[PDB]
Amino acid sequence: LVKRHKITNNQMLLMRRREPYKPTMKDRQEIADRAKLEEFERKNADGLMFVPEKALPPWQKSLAHNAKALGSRINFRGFRVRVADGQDEPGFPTPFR
Amino acid sequence: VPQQLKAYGGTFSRSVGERSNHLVSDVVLQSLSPSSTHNSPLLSKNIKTKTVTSFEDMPLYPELRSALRQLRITTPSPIQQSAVEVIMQRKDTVVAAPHGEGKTLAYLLPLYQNMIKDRDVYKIPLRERRPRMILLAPTRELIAQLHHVCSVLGEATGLHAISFTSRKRANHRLSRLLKQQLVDVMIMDPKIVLRLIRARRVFLDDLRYVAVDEADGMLSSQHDHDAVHLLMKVQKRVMFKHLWPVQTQTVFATAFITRKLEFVVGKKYPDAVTCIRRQRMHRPPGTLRHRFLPVEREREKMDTLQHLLKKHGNRPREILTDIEEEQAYSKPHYLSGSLEELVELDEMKERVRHALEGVRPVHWGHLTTVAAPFTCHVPRTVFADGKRCIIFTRGIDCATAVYHRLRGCGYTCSLLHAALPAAVRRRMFADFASGRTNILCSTDVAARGLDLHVDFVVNFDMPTNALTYLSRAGRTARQGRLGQVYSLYTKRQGVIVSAVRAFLQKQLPLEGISNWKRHMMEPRYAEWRTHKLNAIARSYVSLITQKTIPAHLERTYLRHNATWRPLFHPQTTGVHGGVPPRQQQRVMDAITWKAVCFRRGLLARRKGGRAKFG
Amino acid sequence: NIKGGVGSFLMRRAAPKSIRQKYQTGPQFYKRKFFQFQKGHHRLHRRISGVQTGSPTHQREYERFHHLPGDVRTRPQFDFTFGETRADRVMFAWRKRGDLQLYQMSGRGETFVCYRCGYPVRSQLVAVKADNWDYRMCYRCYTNTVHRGMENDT
RNA sequence: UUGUAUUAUUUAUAUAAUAGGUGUAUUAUAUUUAAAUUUUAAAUUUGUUGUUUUAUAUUUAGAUACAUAUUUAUAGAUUAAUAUAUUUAAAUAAUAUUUUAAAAUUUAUUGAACUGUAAUGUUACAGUUGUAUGUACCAAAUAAAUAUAGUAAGAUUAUUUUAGUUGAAUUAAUAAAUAAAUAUUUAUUUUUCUUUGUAAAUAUUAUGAACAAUUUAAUUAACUAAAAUGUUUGAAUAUUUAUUUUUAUAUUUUUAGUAGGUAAAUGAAAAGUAUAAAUGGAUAUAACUUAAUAUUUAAUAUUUGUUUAAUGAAAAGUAUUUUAUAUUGUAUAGUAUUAUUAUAGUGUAUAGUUUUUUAAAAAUAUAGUUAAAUAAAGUAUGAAUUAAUAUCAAAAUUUUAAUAAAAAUUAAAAAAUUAAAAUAGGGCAAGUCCUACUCUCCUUUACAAAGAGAACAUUAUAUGUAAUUGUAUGUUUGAUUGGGGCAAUACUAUAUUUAUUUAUAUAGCAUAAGAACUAUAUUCUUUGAAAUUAUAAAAGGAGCAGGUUAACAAGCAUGUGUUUCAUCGUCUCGUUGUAAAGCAGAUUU
Ligand SMILES: Nc1ncnc2c1ncn2[C@@H]1O[C@H](COP(=O)(O)OP(=O)(O)O)[C@@H](O)[C@H]1O
Ligand SMILES: [Mg+2]
């Protein structure tokens, strides 16, 4: 059904849209998409930070830890396991790289 | 007895947004009608159709003008007219053209102009592993063709372009190439480009141009979305702020525009211009003839193929002895000839080329030209009487089977499919291109954007979708060269062949077609409603104009010939005949009362005036 | 036999069989293929309606269609009410605007087909071409033709 | 019943003086100062209707997702696996899930008094079925059952409300920020003149357009009042060129007062939740599926008992034969009736063996040209279909979304009785024609699959296999289970070759023990040609759909001869139109 509303004057009777100052559905989608794109670009303004092992999502953290388990128990620098699930290479130099 | 009132007996299609809602994008085309374009995320925003009708009007460097003079290009195709302006304006662009309007030049020449501008005016330096332009193409043959078309431009303009494919030591060879020669353009598969990026053999620091030659396949799952991932990496690079501002632009050349391509481009590059001519989009050229040959059984297909080859002049070598048969099966038999010999059988040379290739003037809006010589990495070094042919099969096994069968029969054939080793594949393609073999048995490998001289295309297995069929058809019907496509079909492809035949007969686009009879028969409720409204209006017009009816019949005539009567629940028409069950309930109540009375009377008559007693 | 399958809805795109029909460049002489009616109508005919606000002694019938522009706002040249009741029921006739002449009848409405729009039209205003009643024309296209100046060229 | 066994629970429509006139009296509808307003509801219809269906009325019957978790009390993850476990919570609870209705099918059983055969009214044969039919719906009948009730439909009980968007979303299928819409619950005080509905969790989500054109541009409202909207002069008249006459104010929606929580959809009792016990409205509410009752049709149809010429069984009735007149028993059928109507076996011929109103007419049924009888109203009795409906819809005109007594304008429509089908009501998207597809049906060489059987192994009944056959039966036009791209020999380096830049190989790598969870960095452990046919095969009344403004047409005929289509020509000749605004068949209700 249509959401009826308590009126405060005949202007509300003549009114069709409850919020005239609000963009229509298509303009809302356009504005939301533009805002999300701008926020994403602002987030990505800096390079892709190479987060450590402990900061990876739950489905990569344990795999990386198991891959590098032996090196953790036997400590010697220069040991890196070339896992597959790690973060993808960005392609350009970054401040964190 | 069961029901005596129906509005629409058949059932409508579940599809809502389009005719082919259920089909995947990479199997069906997308309707380009404005009604669909309105909801489309790409075709609605920006579409460029105005044209500049001369390269002289186009701002081009003398180097580019000399390059196109060498290529023999003198008049711009409408696609080039529409696309050069926007690519020079440096906007992400989607060029569409019906398989042979010059998309390669359309998206290459402006990009080379921009690269020259960057190198000279802006003086952007050239680094070792940071190329200016990345060009993407699916097949190795297309990669080589693009490498040739880019090498001519590079030799003309001082730029450098490389290309790489699968080899023995792929990693070593590619790394050696990168170490040795710094490059401006790299034509390579997106998979290899991603390999290089992940192994940080190449960098996007100085990359400014991305070009895709087959956007449909590249952005579809048919190629693993490698191009999509590469483009997302490019977008990340553009977003990156600490490096010098590079407004990387993407060009997508696509003979088809599908749901996948349009959605990807619309949702990633919102400010993407589109260059399409809906009137000639998704249709074969006008200089292409079609012949759909039915076969009683799959066995007759080989005989039909032999008949077609003999008719077009690829006569076999008659075998009459065991040694001859053995050598025919074992060793290849290349053809030989020369231009002078063919003539007996450089304006004069160009005229001979026109006559041999069937070139005819290309009739555009208000100007005409003649198709330029093909752009392939293997020139036609050998000429033979027989007409060039290409036979597309269902798969690798069918391709090799047809190849061996023709060789045994006596024809000279080449084979092309992925499973062949690198050397054999190169040799086969080189043979066919140079003309030492006038018949090429292949699969869809060669159907994706190859500029090669083929007089006709045989489909040894009729395609089930418009995409592959139209690509194979366009392989032969170039700018203005005459082309012919035969298609050997069976009972299985009846629906698709009938649909394509009707569409080609009345010259309307193959926007949605399939091999499923239910899909091609059942309408979509709103479309059926529109057609029914038009039909009712036409019937009303005919009744008004021709017939005159009395007052006591006006009501019935208008009800049954001039009124639009909407269905009850189109989603359940297959169950309730498109009529309310309540009205159906009343109708069946009355009819059942009448039928019960009639049955009682009939029983009385048959038993002697009394049913129980008789 | 290899029996295929193709829906009529697919072929309906090419229903027009001429430039005039496909691209509506000229008057549609009972050969219009595609019609655009209102979203709620069921009888599928255009309506050129009038309004009455009093008896004939205060509002003449031709004044009913006074909300529409064109010749209808001018007093008709010929009135056929006082004398007799013509069989066709035409009660008013306007001055010939070229070879076209406009008539108004005292009936609920005659559902004719106009050769310019091509749509069935139900109204009392009918424009006839060079006195030939076989070619009727609705008031909308009559007014448009007069405005464009194509009175003698339709 | 050694507690009306106990405890709770439920419960009937037999029954009837009710009033002698508040509104009008030339026609529009409750509130009496006269006017104005007024002329169904629910579901269906997503092209939102004028489509579709239901409702006579009274009373009653009638449908289930737990709106809430107080001390004993203690709750991780994680790998394919081994294993690893640096490292923050919590109210352990389950049982449910509208309602009516599928052509149903399944199990078990009966029926040959009807009907259809064979036998000579009776006997025998019956639902993988006997001979069109098998006891007044033949996909029979009886008994049991709640099938994917879903991708049929309908119904669905609680007024006075207190917060966001009203046409978006749409990419199948390898390393890509994000579906949106609606609803429910919930979250964030970031600075700039003003203003601004962003986000999360959760539930659901086919209401469905074909062309052309253009485009990197175009049914809602608290009351009172207020209130701003709305027929001549580039001609005419005239004579042989001259005349004529070419702003306002005001009327219906830019406001207050008063009511009154707040910006609209999750019922209310302190009286069995009893200590309460003589004056508790505990008024706490389903317009259409149930049951009963009262009406309309209805002053109705129907009924109407003044005249008789003639069977002696039995199945069949059981209607109280007072004592009807060896043992046992005498009268009063069937079709739902005291009905169309003799049940006839035998058998006989003069028993008068005894219930059919009414004072006309229409209509209806019977009854000396050519190829006149019978059935009335009225007295009396008294059904049935039907029934949303206000005391009702004269008529015309005009119009609105399909008949539109729906709307508006205009106009003027008396009451009763009889007759008359003119309109509406009384099931109907149908008829013909052309195309297309499918079904039924036929056939066999392929597919599945029966059952049955032959043969085989082991020693007249079986077990184990079963390639034949049947083809009863079910199928037999969605091929992306494809194609492409990936090709050990990383790294640094060298050499040769090259279809005018490909191709190929190789030199370098052992070993090393004190600082204690550890630092984006590396392409090295080794795939280079699957020489199609799966998909059972095929032929020509009914069903669905389209078109009816057909289909075809750089043609036709056998290189040549020839315009297309049509206007009702002519005995080859030729006029006219046309190049589509042209040409098949149909054009009926
Ligand atoms: N203005 C032009 N004039 C003549 N030929 C052209 C022109 N533009 C491109 N071509 C030629 O026409 C052929 C097809 O060009 P191509 O770009 O490969 O087709 P596609 O657009 O499908 O990729 C090629 O031989 C090409 O050289
Ligand atoms: Mg191309």
Ligand SMILES: [Zn+2]
């Ligand atoms: Zn018109």
